[PDB]
Coordinates of C-alpha atoms and ligand atoms in Angstrom, one line a residue:
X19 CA 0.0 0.0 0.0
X20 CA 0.8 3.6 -1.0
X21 CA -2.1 5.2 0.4
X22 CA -2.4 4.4 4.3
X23 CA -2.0 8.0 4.9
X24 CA -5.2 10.2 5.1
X25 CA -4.4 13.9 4.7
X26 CA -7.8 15.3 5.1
X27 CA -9.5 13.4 8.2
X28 CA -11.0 14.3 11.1
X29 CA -10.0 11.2 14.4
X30 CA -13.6 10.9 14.5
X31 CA -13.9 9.9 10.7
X32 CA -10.4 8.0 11.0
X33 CA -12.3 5.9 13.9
X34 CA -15.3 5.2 11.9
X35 CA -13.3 4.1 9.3
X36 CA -11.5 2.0 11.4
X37 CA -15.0 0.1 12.5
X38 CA -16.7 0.2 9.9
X39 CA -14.0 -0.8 6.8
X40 CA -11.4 -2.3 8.9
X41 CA -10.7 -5.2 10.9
X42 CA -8.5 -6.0 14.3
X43 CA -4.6 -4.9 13.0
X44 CA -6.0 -2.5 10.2
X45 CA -4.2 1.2 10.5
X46 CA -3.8 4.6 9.0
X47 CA -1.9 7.6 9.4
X48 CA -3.3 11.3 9.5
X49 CA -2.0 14.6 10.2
X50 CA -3.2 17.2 12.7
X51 CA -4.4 20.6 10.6
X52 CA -4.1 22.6 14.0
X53 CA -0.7 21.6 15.6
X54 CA 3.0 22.0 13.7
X55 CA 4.0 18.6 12.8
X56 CA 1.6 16.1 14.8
X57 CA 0.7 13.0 13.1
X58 CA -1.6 10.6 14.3
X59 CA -1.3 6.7 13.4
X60 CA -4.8 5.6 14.3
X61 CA -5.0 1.2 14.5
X62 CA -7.4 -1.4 15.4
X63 CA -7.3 -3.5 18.2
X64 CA -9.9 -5.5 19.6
X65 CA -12.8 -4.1 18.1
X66 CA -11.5 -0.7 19.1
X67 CA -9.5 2.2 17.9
X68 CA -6.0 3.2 19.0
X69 CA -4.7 6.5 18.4
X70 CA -0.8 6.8 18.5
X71 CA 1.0 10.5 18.7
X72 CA 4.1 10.7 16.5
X73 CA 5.7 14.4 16.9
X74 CA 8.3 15.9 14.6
X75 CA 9.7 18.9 15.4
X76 CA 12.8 19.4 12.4
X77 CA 14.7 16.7 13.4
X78 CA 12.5 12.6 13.2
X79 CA 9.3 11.1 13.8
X80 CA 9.0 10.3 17.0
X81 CA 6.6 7.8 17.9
X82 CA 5.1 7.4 20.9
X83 CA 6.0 4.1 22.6
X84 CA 8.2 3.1 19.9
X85 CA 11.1 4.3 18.0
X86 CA 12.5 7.5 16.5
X87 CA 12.1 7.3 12.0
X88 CA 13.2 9.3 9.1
X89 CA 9.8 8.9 7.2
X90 CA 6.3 7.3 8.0
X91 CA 6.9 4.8 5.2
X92 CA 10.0 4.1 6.6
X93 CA 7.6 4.1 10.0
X94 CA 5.5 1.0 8.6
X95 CA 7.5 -0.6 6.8
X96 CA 9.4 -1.2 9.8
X97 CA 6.7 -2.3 12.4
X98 CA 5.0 -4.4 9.2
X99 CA 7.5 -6.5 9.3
X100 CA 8.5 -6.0 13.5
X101 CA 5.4 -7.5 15.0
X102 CA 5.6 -7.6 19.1
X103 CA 7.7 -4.0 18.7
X104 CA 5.1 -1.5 18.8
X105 CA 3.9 -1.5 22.6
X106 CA 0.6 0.7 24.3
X107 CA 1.8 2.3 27.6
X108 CA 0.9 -0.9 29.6
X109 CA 3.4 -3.1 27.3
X110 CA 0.4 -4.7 25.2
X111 CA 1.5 -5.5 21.7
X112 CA 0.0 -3.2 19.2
X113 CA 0.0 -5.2 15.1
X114 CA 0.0 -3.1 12.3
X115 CA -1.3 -5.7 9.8
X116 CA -3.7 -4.2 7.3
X117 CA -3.0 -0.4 5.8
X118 CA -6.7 1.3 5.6
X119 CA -6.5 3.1 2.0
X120 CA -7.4 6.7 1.3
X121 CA -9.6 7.3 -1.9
X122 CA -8.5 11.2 -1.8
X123 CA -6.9 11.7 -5.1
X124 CA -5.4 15.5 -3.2
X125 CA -1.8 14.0 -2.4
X126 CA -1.2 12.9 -5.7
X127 CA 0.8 15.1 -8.1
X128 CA -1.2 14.4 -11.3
X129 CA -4.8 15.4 -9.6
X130 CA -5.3 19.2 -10.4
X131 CA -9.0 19.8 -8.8
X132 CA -10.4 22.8 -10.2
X133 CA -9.6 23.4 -14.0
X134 CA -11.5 24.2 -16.9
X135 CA -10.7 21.9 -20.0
X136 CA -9.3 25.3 -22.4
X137 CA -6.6 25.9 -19.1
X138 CA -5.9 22.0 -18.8
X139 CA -5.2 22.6 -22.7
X140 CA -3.0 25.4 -22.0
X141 CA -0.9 23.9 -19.0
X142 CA -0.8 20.6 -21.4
X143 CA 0.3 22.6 -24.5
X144 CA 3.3 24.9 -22.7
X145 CA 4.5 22.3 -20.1
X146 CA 3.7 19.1 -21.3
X147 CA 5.3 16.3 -23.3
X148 CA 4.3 13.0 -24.7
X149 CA 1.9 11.2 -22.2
X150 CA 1.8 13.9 -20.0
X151 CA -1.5 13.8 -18.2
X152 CA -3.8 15.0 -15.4
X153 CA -6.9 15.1 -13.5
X154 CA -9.3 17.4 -12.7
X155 CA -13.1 18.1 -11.7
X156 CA -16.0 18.0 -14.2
X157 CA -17.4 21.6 -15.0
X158 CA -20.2 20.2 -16.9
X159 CA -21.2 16.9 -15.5
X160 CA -20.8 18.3 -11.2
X161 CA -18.9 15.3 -9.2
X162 CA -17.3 14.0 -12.1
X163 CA -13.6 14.2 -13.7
X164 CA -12.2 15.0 -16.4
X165 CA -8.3 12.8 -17.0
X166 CA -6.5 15.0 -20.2
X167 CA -3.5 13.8 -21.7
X168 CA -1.0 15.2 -24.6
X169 CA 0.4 13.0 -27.2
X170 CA 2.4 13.6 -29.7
X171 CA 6.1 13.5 -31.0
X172 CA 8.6 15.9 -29.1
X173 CA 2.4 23.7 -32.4
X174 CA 1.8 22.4 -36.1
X175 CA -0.5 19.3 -35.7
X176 CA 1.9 16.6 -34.9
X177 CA 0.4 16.4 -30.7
X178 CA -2.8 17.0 -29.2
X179 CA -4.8 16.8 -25.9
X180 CA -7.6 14.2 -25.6
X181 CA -10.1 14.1 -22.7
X182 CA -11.6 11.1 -21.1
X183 CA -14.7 11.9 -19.2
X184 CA -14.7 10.0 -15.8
X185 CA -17.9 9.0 -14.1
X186 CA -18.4 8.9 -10.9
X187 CA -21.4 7.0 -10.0
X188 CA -22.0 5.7 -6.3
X189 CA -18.4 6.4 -4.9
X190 CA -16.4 4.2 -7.7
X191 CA -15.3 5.9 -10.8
X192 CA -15.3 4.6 -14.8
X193 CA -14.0 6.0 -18.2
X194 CA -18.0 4.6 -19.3
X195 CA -17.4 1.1 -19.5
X196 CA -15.4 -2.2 -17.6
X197 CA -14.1 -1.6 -14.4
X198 CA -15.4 0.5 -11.7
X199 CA -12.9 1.6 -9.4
X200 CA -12.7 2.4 -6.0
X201 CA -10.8 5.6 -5.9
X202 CA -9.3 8.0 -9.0
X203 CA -5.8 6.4 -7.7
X204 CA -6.7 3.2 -8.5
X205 CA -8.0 4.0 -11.9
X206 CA -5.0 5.9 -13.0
X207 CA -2.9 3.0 -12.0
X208 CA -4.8 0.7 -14.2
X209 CA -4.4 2.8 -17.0
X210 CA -1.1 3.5 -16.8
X211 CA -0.6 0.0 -17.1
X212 CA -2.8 -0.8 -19.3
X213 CA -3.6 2.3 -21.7
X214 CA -6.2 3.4 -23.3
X215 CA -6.6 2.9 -27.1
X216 CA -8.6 5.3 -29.6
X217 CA -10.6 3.6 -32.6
X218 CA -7.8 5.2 -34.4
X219 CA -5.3 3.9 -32.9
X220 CA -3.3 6.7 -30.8
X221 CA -2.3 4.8 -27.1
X222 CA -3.1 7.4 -24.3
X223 CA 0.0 6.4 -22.6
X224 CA -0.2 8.2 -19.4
X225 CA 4.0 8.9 -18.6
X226 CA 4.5 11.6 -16.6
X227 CA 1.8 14.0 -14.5
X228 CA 1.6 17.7 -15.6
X229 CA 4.3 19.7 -13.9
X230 CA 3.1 22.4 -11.5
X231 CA 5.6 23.4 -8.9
X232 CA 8.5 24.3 -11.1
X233 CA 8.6 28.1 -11.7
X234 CA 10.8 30.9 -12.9
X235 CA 12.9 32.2 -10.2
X236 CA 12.2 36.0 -10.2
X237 CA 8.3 34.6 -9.9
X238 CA 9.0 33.3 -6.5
X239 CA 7.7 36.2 -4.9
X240 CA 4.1 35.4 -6.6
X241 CA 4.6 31.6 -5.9
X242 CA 4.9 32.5 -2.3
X243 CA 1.5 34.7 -1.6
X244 CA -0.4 32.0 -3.6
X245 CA 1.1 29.7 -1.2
X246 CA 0.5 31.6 1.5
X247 CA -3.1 31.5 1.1
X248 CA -1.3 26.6 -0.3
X249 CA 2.1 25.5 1.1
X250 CA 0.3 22.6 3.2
X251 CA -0.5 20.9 0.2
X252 CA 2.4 21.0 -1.8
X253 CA 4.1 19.4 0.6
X254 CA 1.5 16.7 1.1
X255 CA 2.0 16.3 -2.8
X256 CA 5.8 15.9 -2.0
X257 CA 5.5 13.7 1.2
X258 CA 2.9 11.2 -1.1
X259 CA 6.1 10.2 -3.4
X260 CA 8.1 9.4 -0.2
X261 CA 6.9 5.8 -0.7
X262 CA 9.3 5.4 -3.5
X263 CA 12.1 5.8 -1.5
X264 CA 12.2 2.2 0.5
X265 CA 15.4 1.8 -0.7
X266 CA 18.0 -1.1 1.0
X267 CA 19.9 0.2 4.4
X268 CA 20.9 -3.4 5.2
X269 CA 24.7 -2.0 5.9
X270 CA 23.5 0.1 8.8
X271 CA 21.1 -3.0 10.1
X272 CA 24.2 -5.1 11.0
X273 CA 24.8 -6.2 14.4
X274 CA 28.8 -4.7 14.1
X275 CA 27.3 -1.4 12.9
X276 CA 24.0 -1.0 15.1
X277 CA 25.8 1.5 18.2
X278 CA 27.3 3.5 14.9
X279 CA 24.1 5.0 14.8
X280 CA 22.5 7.6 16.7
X281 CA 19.1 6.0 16.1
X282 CA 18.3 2.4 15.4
X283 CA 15.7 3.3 12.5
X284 CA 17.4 6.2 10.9
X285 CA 20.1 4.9 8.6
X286 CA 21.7 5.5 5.3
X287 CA 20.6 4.2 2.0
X288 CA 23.4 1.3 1.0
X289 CA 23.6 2.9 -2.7
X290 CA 24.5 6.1 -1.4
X291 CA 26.2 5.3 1.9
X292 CA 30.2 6.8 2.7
X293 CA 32.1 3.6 2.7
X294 CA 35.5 4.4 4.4
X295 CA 38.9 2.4 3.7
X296 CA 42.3 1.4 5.0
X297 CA 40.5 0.6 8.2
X298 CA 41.7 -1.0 11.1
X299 CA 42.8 -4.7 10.0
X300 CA 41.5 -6.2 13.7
X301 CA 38.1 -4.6 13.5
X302 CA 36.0 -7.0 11.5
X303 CA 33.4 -4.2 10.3
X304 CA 35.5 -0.8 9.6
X305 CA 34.0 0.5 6.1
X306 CA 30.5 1.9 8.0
X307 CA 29.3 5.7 9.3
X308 CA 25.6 6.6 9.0
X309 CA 26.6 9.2 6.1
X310 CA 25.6 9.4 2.3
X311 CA 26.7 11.5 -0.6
X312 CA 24.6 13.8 -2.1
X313 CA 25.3 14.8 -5.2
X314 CA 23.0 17.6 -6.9
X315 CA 21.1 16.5 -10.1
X316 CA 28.6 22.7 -8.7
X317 CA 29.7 21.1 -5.4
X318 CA 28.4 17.8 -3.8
X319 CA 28.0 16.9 0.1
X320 CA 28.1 14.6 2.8
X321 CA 25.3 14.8 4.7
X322 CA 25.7 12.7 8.2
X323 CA 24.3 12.4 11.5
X324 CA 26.2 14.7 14.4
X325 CA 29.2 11.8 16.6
X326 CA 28.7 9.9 19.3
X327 CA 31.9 9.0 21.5
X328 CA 32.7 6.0 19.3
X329 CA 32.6 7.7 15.7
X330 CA 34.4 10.5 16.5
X331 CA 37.8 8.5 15.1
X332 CA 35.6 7.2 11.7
X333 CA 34.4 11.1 11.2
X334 CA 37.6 11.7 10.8
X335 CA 38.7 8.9 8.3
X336 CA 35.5 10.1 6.4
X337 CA 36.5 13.9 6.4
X338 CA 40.7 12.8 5.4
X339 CA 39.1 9.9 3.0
X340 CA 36.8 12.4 1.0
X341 CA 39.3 15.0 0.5
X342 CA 36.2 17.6 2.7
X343 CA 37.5 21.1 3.4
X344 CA 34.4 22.7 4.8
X345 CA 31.9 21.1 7.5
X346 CA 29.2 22.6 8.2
X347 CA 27.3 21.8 11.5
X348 CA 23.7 23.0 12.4
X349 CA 23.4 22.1 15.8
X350 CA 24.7 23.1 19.4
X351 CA 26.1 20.2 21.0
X352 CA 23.6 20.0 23.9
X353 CA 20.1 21.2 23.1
X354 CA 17.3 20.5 25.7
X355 CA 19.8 19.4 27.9
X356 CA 20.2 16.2 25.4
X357 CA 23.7 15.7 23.2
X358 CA 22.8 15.8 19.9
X359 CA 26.7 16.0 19.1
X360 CA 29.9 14.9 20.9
X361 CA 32.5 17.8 20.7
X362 CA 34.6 16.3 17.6
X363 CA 37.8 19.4 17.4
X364 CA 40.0 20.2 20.0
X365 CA 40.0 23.2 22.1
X366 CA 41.6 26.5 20.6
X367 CA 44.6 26.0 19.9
X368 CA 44.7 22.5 21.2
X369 CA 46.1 19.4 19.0
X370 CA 44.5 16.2 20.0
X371 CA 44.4 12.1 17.6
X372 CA 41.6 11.0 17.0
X373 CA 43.1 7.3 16.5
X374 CA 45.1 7.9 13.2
X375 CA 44.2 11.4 12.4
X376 CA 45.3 14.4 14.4
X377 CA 43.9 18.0 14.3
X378 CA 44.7 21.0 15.5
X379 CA 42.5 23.9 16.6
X380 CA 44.4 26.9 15.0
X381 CA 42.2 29.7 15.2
X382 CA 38.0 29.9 16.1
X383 CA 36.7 33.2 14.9
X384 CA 33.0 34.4 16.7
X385 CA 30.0 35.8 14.5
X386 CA 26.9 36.2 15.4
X387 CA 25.2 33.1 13.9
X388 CA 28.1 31.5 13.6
X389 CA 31.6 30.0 15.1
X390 CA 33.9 29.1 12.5
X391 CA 37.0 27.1 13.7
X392 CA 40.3 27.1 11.2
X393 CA 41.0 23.1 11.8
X394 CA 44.0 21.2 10.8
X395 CA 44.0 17.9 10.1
X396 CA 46.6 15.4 8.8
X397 CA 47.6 11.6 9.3
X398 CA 50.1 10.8 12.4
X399 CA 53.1 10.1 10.9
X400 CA 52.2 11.2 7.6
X401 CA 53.2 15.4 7.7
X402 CA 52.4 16.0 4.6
X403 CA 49.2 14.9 4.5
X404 CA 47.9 18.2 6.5
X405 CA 45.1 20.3 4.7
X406 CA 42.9 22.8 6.5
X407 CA 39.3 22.2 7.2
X408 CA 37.2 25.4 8.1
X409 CA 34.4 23.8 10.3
X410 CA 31.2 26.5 10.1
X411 CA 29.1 25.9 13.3
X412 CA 25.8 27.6 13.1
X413 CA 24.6 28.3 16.8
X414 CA 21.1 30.0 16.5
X415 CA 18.7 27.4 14.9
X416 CA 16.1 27.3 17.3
X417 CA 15.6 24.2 19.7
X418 CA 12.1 23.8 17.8
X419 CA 10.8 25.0 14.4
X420 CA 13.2 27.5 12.4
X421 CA 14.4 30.7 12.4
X422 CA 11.8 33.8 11.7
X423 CA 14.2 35.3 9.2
X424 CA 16.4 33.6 6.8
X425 CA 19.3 36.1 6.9
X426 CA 21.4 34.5 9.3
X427 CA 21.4 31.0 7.0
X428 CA 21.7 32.7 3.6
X429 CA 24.4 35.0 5.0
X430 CA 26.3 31.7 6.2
X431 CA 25.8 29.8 3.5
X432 CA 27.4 32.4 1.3
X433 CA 30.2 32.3 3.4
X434 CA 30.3 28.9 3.4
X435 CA 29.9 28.6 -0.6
X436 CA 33.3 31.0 -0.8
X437 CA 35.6 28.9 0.9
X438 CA 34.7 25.8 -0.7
X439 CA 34.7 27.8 -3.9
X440 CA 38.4 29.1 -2.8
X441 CA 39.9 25.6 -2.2
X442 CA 41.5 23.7 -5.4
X443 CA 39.8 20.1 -5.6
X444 CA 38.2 20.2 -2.6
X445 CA 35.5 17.3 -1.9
X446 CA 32.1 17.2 -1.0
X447 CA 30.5 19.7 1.6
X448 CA 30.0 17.7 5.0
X449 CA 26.8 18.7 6.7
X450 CA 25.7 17.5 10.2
X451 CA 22.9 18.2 12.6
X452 CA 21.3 15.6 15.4
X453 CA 20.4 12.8 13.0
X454 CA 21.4 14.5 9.9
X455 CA 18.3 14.8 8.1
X456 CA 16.1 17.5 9.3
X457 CA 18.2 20.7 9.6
X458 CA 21.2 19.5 7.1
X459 CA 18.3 18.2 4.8
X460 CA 17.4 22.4 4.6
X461 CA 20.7 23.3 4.8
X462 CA 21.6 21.5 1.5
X463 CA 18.5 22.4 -0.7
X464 CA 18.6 26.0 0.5
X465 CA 22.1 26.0 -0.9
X466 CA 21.5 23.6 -3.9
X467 CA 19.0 25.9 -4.8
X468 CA 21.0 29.3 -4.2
X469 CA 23.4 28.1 -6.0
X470 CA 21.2 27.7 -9.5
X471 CA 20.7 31.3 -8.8
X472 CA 24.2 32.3 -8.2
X473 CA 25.1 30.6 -11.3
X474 CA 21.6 31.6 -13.9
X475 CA 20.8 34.8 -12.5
X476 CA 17.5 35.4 -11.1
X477 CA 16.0 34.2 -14.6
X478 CA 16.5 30.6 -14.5
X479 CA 13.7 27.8 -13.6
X480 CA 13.6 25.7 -10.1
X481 CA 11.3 23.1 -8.4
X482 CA 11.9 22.6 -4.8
X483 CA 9.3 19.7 -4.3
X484 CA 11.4 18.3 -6.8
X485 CA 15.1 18.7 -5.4
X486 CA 13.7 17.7 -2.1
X487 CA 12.7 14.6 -4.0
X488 CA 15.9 14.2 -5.4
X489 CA 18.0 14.7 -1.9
X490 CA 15.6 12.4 -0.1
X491 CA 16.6 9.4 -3.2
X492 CA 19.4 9.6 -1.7
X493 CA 19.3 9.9 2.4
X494 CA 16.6 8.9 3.8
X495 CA 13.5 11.7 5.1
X496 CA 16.3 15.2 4.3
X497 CA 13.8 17.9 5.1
X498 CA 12.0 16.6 8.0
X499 CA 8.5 18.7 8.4
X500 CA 6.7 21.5 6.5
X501 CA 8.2 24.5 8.8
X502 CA 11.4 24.0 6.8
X503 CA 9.4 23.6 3.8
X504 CA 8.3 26.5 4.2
X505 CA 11.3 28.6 5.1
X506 CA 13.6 26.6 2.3
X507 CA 11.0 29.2 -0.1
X508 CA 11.7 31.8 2.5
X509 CA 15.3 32.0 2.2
X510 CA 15.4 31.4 -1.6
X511 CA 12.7 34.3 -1.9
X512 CA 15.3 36.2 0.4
X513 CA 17.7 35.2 -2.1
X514 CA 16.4 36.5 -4.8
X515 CA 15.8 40.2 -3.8
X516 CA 19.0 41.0 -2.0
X517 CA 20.5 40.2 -5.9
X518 CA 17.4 42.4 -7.3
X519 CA 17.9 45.0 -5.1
X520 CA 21.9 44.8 -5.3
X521 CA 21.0 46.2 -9.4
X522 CA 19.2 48.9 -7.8
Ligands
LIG30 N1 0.6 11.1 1.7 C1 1.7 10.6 2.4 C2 2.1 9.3 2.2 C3 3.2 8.9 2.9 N2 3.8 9.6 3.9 C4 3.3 10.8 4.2 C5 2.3 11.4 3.4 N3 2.1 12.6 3.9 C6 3.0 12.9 4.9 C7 3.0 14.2 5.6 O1 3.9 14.4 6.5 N4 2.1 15.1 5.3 C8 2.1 16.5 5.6 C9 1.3 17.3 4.9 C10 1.2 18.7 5.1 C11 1.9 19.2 6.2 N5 2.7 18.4 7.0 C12 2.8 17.1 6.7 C13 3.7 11.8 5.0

């Protein structure tokens, strides 16, 4: 199942649900619409309904009773297969067996609502391609839908838009004969597998949905009071494809590599994971840190989760390995009176090995967002193998939520940006918070972003739904909840105008 979450229910509805459609072990996942990041994962249990709080507040999932998680899907797929391992307060086993499926076409990317057939036409003829397609409501026939799709080859005659009037007819939906489906999902699924054929012959392959969150860069401003109301579901439309993203972690699973990680659940993809060498010949398992590469698709970057007391020396070998100049870390060490990371650099001025790395402290410099600390780092015995690494250590993020204004972050960012720029051959970009998804998950599309900008000018396209998309391929759940959503347009909006206004 794709569809267990429920974006639009009330607990009341989600119970009745429950009773009436599902059975003991049946389960689905809503959000709250009145609280910042509170999720709800609402299962059966003895003829009655259980509701379970998960809270995110930037950094995980954190479900109640049970374990910290990157993504929901991640969430159950892990307790779909972990039965005994999601416990009520009193201990009793709670089974997630059967996902309850949501017939609300709103978190998928090709439903478009509202939308006359001449605009559908319109959006189709300047954005589409072969087999692009969407959905939207009847204007005509009230409570049905309309699915349009362009075909053609790559305006004089050689593609066209065709239109496929949907019934709906007692809560199951039809193209006028054959099957009646049970939601708009499940009839688009069909049909892209098994497409529609004119008398004529032309196959409405349905390929790719219509486009509708990439936009011109000096538009953003506009893009930003029409999501202002917007933004809520935009990033329901981006948390729906999430389910995609099950990709293998079964490095980070292993037994040897379990206390490597800061939580259990929250682990890197194997595909994209930092695999260190020249390890320790008497440690059985030396090639594992909960790290991956991200590489935009002019700089790439490790994102990873802030050390415990036992990486500290594998950070290291990561930072020396990957040739990494510039670290960027987005948390304090202690927040809530919790580590979230282990002090990894000496003192200033201080020298201290980290097993077969040393680095000195040369220099910390204060701003007011901001410590940056000049760090030297080389291989004992090996003096030539020093390089500097300027570690950037943003203080101010707030314990919860983000910051009001995105100066401070698009002012260090720059900074940051420079001296990588500066340094010949430098590798990827390391980025760290707490788990290393939430906060360095923002940090990385913010500057992913910028940098399209720095590069194009302000007239150049960009789609953050879908360079989140592309980050999250490749570490699991970067950019945690829709507050940094939110501000990731913030800064980039920010962005934008301090380059207009530098013309000015
Ligand atoms: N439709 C989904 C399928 C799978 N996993 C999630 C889904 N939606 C999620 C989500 O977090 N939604 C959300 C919306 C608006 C604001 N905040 C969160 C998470």
């Amino acid at each position: 199942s794709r569809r267990w979450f429920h974006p639009n229910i009330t607990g009341v509805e989600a119970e009745n649900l429950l009773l009436t459609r599902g059975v003991d072990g049946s389960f689905l996942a809503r959000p709250s619409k009145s609280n910042p990041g509170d999720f709800t994962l609402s299962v059966r249990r003895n003829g009655a309904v259980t509701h379970i709080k998960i809270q995110n507040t930037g950094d995980y999932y954190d479900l109640y009773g049970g374990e910290k998680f990157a993504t929901l899907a991640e969430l159950v797929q892990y307790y779909m297969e972990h039965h005994g391992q999601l416990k009520e307060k009193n201990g009793d086993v709670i089974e997630l067996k059967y996902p309850l499926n949501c017939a609300d076409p709103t978190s998928e990317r090709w439903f478009h609502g509202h939308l006359s057939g001449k605009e559908a036409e319109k959006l189709l003829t300047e954005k589409g391609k072969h087999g692009s397609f969407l959905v939207r409501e009847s204007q005509s026939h009230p409570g049905d839908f309309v699915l349009s799709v362009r075909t053609g080859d790559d305006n004089d005659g050689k593609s066209k838009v065709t239109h496929v009037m949907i019934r709906c007819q007692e809560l199951k939906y039809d193209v006028g004969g054959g099957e009646r489906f049970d939601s708009l999902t499940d009839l688009v699924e069909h049909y892209k597998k098994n497409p529609m054929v004119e008398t004529l012959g032309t196959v409405l392959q349905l390929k790719q949905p219509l486009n509708t969150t990439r936009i011109n860069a000096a538009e953003i401003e506009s893009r930003v009071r029409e999501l202002s109301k917007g933004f809520w579901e935009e990033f329901e439309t981006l948390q729906q494809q999430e389910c995609k993203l099950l990709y293998s972690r079964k490095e980070g699973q292993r037994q040897e590599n379990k206390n490597k990680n800061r939580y259990k659940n929250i682990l890197p993809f194997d595909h994209t994971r930092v695999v260190l060498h020249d390890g320790d010949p008497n440690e059985p398992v030396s090639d594992y840190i909960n790290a991956n590469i991200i590489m935009p698709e002019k700089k790439s970057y490790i994102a990873t989760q802030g050390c415990l007391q036992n990486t500290v020396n594998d950070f290291w070998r990561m930072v020396f390995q990957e040739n990494s100049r510039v670290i960027v870390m987005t948390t304090k060490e202690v927040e809530r009176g919790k580590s979230k990371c282990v002090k990894y650099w000496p003192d200033e001025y201080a020298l201290k090995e980290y097993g077969v790395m040393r680095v000195r402290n040369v220099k910390e410099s204060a701003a007011h967002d901001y410590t940056l600390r000049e760090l030297k780092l080389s291989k004992v015995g090996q003096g030539n193998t020093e390089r500097t690494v300027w570690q950037y250590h943003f203080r101010t993020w707030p314990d919860h939520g983000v910051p009001s204004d995105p100066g401070g972050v698009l002012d260090f960012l720059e900074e940051v940006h420079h001296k990588q720029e500066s340094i010949m051959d430098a590798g990827p970009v390391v980025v760290h918070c707490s788990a290393g998804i939430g906060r360095t998950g923002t940090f990385i599309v913010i500057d992913i972003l910028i940098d399209i900008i720095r590069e194009k000018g302000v007239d150049c396209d960009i789609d953050v739904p879908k360079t989140i998309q592309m980050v999250r391929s490749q570490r699991s759940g970067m950019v945690q909840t829709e507050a940094q959503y939110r501000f990731i347009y913030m800064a980039v909006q920010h962005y934008i105008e301090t380059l207009q206004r530098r013309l000015e």
